[PDB]
């Protein structure tokens, strides 16, 4: 919903079986990392908004 903050990392249960709080098959951590390097092209460079 508009203007909402979520910070809790629960292992995504896309599969039909509970993840039990660990990573594995059909169990991925929701958070993913940008990697910023000077040689990256415009459009992948980090932008401050």
């Amino acid at each position: 919903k508009p203007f909402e903050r979520d910070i809790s990392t629960e292992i995504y249960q896309a599969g039909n079986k509970p993840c039990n709080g660990v990573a594995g098959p059909n169990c991925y951590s929701p958070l993913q990392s940008y990697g910023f390097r000077p040689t990256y092209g415009v459009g992948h460079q980090p932008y401050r908004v």
Binding site: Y28, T39, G41
Partner: protein, 596 residues
């Protein structure tokens, strides 16, 4: 939920991790190639091992989803690419010995040295000196010695190794779903699931055979002309009805006849078009060479180069202390980074090569939006085809005069067109029979039609029947003639060159119709036509998402490769060859051989 959504989330995670890992590997490789040192080698090795391990892990993971439940026609292709089992299905000992055989073949090909006859002073490697001798030396005896010595040096050594290689790769293919390793190689051209645009793995065989059946008249007439010229150059060695001897073709394997332009020149008086002196007089450098190449793609409607590209790319040879490889390459490192590694000097060939590389980068930029697995050309041929169409258009006299390198005074006659068409003929038409023959031989060997005891007999018989080339010194089964070629030794597919050769001229015909050119196809420039640029960009943006059949339909209006554009391109030379071959026999007789 459904496995389709599960597979979708898996693909998203894989894409976002693989982009970063591939960027690290590509940056390590670029650093190694630009600046060769032990630390750079260690970093590149680490990055490559990490990327290979990640690909193996993700390929093992992806096998959970059956492809039957996937019906998006994009997720299916990505999961198919991941499930191709890059993880070696073979046993541990089988994999270790296959790697050992590949390493041994590469080592023997790279370190194969030929020594002088009864002279231990020098033992020459293939690439540095022997290739130059074969290319430029006009000594029949020396060329025959070089060819025979290289054959005995490498083919005899690699024959048991090549037999073990074919056995192991056939076992790998049998372990996979593909019939044989030829089927594994042809699987790239396969299209499944899209009715009305589909392709079959065996359909490539029929298409290649039919295309060569159409090409054969032009090759026969060019063969007759080259036979007459080489008979004039070497009086006693060449027979009128017989096939050409192998060593006199121009290179070690007969792949390219470009070295024969001097011997078979149509008109000596007419000088070839070359802009080296003009560029020197106008004081150009590599940076503005690449800028002029960029202006062409800007004119056709495609985007222009990135500031990051200009900053990071090394287009000029550093020289002095710096050590680097000078093989031209266009790098799509990933995440918006594009670079050229080229030691570019002020020459016409370097200018055209710069055009070719920037064509590569425009393709890479176009398919950047698509997922990582699909971020490639639709088939192995389209990528160099897109390079080669730009290379061909750049060298046109109209483009040269528009740029201003060529003076307004000059006008092209019949002789200049004939000379240029015949040079490009020896470059392009000549390699098609060799590629056809090599792929047919290798496919038959993989399928098992050619027995081991008749490997080389069938090889040379098919070369005599198809390519019209006869072995100078007869060779028994101990020799392994194909093993000498680089692609055969290092296990590279070779039908890509045939497909590229057809595709580039189909693209050129389509884009010349788009540009509304009137006249012969050779004097066609697509510079200022924005219709042709958009028609190309339609395919360039797709990547592998759509089938290559649909991409080719989008560009040229046909779902299958056709040699009609190539024949239309070389029609003037075809007429000139009819005229010149009135007093020369057309066709070759198999019976004649230099021996007996």
């Amino acid at each position: 939920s459904t496995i389709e959504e599960q597979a979708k989330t898996f693909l998203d995670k894989f894409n976002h991790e693989a982009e970063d890992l591939f960027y690290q590997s590509s940056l390590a490789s670029w650093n190694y190639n630009t600046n060769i040192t032990e630390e750079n080698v260690q970093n590149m090795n680490n990055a490559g091992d990490k990327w290979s391990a990640f690909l193996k892990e993700q390929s093992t993971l992806a096998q959970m989803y059956p492809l039957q439940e996937i019906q998006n026609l994009t997720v299916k292709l990505q999961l198919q690419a991941l499930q191709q089992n890059g993880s070696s299905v073979l046993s541990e000992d089988k994999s270790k010995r296959l790697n050992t055989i590949l390493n041994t073949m590469s080592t023997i090909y790279s370190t194969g040295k030929v020594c002088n006859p009864d002279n231990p002073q020098e033992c020459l490697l293939l690439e540095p000196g022997l290739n130059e001798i074969m290319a430029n030396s006009l000594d029949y005896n020396e060329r025959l010695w070089a060819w025979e010595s290289w054959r005995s040096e490498v083919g005899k050594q690699l024959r048991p190794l090549y037999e073990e290689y074919v056995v192991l790769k056939n076992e790998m293919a049998r372990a996979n779903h593909y019939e044989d390793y030829g089927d594994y190689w042809r699987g790239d051209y396969e299209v499944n699931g899209v009715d009305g645009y589909d392709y079959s793995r065996g359909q490539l065989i029929e298409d290649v055979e039919h295309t060569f059946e159409e090409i054969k008249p032009l090759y026969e007439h060019l063969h007759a002309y080259v036979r007459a010229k080489l008979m004039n150059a070497y009086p006693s060695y060449i027979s009128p009805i017989g096939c050409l001897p192998a060593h006199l073709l121009g290179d070690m394997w007969g792949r390219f006849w470009t070295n024969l332009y001097s011997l078979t020149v149509p008109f000596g008086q007419k000088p070839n078009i070359d802009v080296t002196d003009a560029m020197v007089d106008q004081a150009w450098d590599a940076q503005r060479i690449f800028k002029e190449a960029e202006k062409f793609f800007v004119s056709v409607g495609l985007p222009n180069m990135t500031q990051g590209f200009w900053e990071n790319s090394m287009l000029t040879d550093p020289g002095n202390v710096q050590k680097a490889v000078c093989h031209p390459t266009a790098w799509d490192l990933g995440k918006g980074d594009f670079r050229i590694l080229m030691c570019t000097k002020v020459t016409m060939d370097d200018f055209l090569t710069a055009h070719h590389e920037m064509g590569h980068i425009q393709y890479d930029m176009a398919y950047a939006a698509q997922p990582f697995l699909l971020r490639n050309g639709a088939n192995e041929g389209f990528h160099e085809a897109v390079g080669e169409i730009m290379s061909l258009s750049a060298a046109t006299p109209k483009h040269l005069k528009s740029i201003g390198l060529l003076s307004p005074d000059f006008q092209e006659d019949n002789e200049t067109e004939i000379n240029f068409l015949l040079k490009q003929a020896l470059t392009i038409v000549g390699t098609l029979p060799f590629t056809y023959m090599l792929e047919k031989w290798r496919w038959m060997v993989f399928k098992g039609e050619i027995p081991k005891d008749q490997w080389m007999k069938k090889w040379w018989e098919m070369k005599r029947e198809i390519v019209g080339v006869v072995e100078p010194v007869p060779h028994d089964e101990t020799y392994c003639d194909p093993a000498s070629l680089f692609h055969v030794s290092n296990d590279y597919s070779f039908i890509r060159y045939y497909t590229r050769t057809l595709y580039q001229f189909q693209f050129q015909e389509a884009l010349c119709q788009a540009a509304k050119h009137e006249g012969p196809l050779h004097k066609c420039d697509i510079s200022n036509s924005t219709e042709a640029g958009q028609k190309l960009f339609n395919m360039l943006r797709l990547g592998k998402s759509e089938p290559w059949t649909l991409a080719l339909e989008n560009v040229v209006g046909a779902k299958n490769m056709n040699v009609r554009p190539l024949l239309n391109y070389f029609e003037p030379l075809f007429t000139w060859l009819k005229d010149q071959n009135k007093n020369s026999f057309v066709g070759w007789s198999t019976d004649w051989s230099p021996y007996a």
